From a paper:
Ndc80c, a heterotetramer of Ndc80, Nuf2, Spc24, and Spc25, is a 600 Å long rod, largely two-chain coiled-coil, with an Ndc80/Nuf2 globular “head” at one end and an Spc24/Spc25 globular knob at the other. The Mps1 and Aurora B kinases regulate and monitor kinetochore attachment to spindle microtubules during cell division, ultimately ensuring accurate chromosome segregation. We show here, biochemically and structurally, that short peptide segments on both Mps1 and Ipl1 bind the site on the Ndc80/Nuf2 head of Ndc80c that we have shown previously to bind an Ipl1-phosphoregulated peptide segment near the C-terminus of Dam147. The Ndc80c head is thus a communication hub for ensuring a robust linkage between centromere and spindle and for integrating the SAC with tension sensing and error correction.
We applied the strategy we used to determine the Dam1-Ndc80c interaction, by generating chimeras with the C-terminus of the Mps1 peptide joined to the N-terminus of Nuf2 as a continuous polypeptide chain. The Mps1: Ndc80cdwarf chimera crystallized in space group C2221 (a = 72.5 Å, b = 168.5 Å, c = 229.6 Å). We recorded diffraction data to a minimum Bragg spacing of 2.9 Å and determined the structure as described in Methods. The N-terminal seven residues of the motif (RRSKRFL) form a short helix, which has a set of contacts with conserved glutamate residues in αH of Ndc80 and with conserved features of Nuf2. In the crystal structure, the guanidinium groups of R152 and R154 both bridge to the carboxylate of Ndc80 E166, and the side-chain NH3+ of K153 projects to the carboxylate of Ndc80 E162. The conserved phenylalanine, Mps1 F156, inserts into a hydrophobic pocket lined by Ndc80 L169, L170 and F172, and Nuf2 M154, with a further contribution from Mps1 L157. The C-terminal six residues of the Mps1 motif (LGPAKR) extend across Nuf2 αG, with contacts from residues 128 and 130–132 (conserved in point-centromere yeast). N128, conserved not only in yeasts but also in metazoans, anchors the end of the motif with hydrogen bonds between its side-chain amide and the main-chain amide and carbonyl of K169 (the penultimate residue in the motif), thus mimicking the hydrogen bonds in an antiparallel β-sheet. This interaction positions the invariant arginine of the motif to salt bridge with Ndc80 D295, likewise conserved in both metazoans and yeast. Residues F8 and P9 together bury the hydrogen-bonding interactions of N128 with the main chain of the penultimate residue in the Mps1 and Dam1 binding motifs and probably contribute both to the strength of those interactions and to correct positioning of the invariant arginine to salt bridge with Ndc80 D295.
Residue numbers in the entry:
A (entry chain B): 151 to 171, 1002 to 1153, 1407 to 1451
B (entry chain D): 1 to 115
C (entry chain C): 6 to 98
D (entry chain A): 113 to 318, 621 to 682
Amino acid sequence: RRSKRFLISNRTTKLGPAKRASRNQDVFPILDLQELVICLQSCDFALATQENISRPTSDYMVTLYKQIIENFMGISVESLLNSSNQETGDGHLQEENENIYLDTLNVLVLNKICFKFFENIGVQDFNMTDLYKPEAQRTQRLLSAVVNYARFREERMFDCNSFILQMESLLGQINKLNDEIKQLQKDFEVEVKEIEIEYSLLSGHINKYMNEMLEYMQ
Amino acid sequence: MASIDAFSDLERRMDGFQKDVAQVLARQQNHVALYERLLQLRVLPGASDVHDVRFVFGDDSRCWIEVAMHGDHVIGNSHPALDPKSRATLEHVLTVQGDLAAFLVVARDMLLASL
Amino acid sequence: NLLDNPVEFLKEVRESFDIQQDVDAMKRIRHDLDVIKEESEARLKLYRSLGVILDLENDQVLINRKNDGNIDILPLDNNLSDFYKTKYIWERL
Amino acid sequence: ARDPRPLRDKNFQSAIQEEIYDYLKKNKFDIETNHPISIKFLKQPTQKGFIIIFKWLYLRLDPGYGFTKSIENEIYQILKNLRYPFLESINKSQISAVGGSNWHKFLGMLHWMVRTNIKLDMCLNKVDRSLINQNTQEITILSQPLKTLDEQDQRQERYELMVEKLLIDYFTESYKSFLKLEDNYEPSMQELKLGFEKFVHIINTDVTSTELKLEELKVDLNRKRYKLHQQVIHVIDITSKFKINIQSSLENSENELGNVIEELRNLE
Ligand code: NI
């Protein structure tokens, strides 16, 4: 289900309207503890407890940040790490030296993706400690920014229903032609077997005719 | 299974069965009719006894003789009148063991000449 | 351009391929040969005792002299007169 | 464990100091930090100069990081977060005084960060290729005739990925305009329309390519069906001729034998 999740008119309406406050230092309306978890349950993510974000652990925040990247940005964290350290055919690198930098660069790639995404939504200061040493107050500011991007996305997804539906029409045309190609080959293949069965019956009948007549003669 | 591409094998068997039927159905022919055309001699009843064989010579069937097969073969009636000397010599051929064909050679020569 | 029902046409050919009709016809032919042998054995035994034997497989006539031991063969062709055939076999034995 | 590298070798120290000096000079370390760098300084460094090099190298790896004025207390936690494989061989007390006899342990870390900074730039460039390649091969991969059903289903997933990327780019640009107090997401929509046009052109090429394969299959199947039907008519005619020939031969023998029997009986 890709690009089909983005097609909604009155299907969900589970998110409030996008709000902006020119008052507070951050352009986002800083959500409190209760209003931040009412989405993440209706929103596609999963939450253990509202207290687990009030005291964010290092392992839970990395899991929650990986799911956020895989949803809003539409990229796989595991697939990008495999492509970030692809086995290069150059004869200069060493496999013993490569084992040292595999763990370091994999964590640095996850940082750049989270830093770029938070930079676009309006947070230009994303550290490596934001995941492996979470803070209760700093997470609330980071999570209040991604939910406002979620409310804004629901209002904009109405303008994108035109493109998604036209993609289904074009994809349906190719699938229809390929189904006709398989249907034409299956119909002819059945036509051959029916004739081969009747011919095999005629060969047995003619051979039986000669065998019975060969007994009375000769 | 049988495929249409294997029709040549059934075609080959049909040719063999087609030739075997023609060869078998042209063997016997007729032997008695051929014997009557070659030797110009017919074996018919004697008009007096149904077991008496009558030998007919020629296509016109004017000359014929009759003999009896039971016991010693005695000469019977004949359309061309035969003198007693010719009749005794014909039975003298049958008196000796010899063969029936030797009697028929003398019989055909005397009956056709007496015509 | 093509066959309207090729599967049915092959079934019609099989259903019209009568086997018992020709098998019964082979019985009548074998019966007629048995009638010919029975009704002609008496004459053929008399003809064979005359010294003339027919060999229709080679289209030849066999005339054997019992005293000389030599056998004369008369082959038949579509150019020999019937008077030639009857004069050679007769008076030869 | 312990560092497998010969950190105390004088020849190895001259090589790593050259790699460090070249990377700092090539990337304009002295211009940004207003601190001159030299090979002589790398052999006998100072505590203030080491912090400048450590902060400069880590800022290129984690740009958003906020450094406190007590930089010595954060080096151990940074190395732990960076997954430094040689953290056990480095003592926490040596961080306050790196210019002593244990400088080779810290000089190897500076070379480890120099290598990591160079390797990260190449690793991030390969990620940019993966996030772009799915819209780069375009019709070349898709126009080829499908070999199985999985490749056709994989072709559909590539099309759905192209549309999903276009929508996310629209949401990203529209929110950035929304943050700047605009509420007019027209230039973001125009970029979406231009990107969607190329997707239609790619699909239309696959539609035309598949329409040709559909017509080529029809002509090929009509030829195959014509040959099969021709073979069927041949079997039917040969069978009929063979049946009549045997039946006619049976009627001839029955009439020829029937006359022979009549000849044997009439001749009486
Ligand atoms: Ni043929």
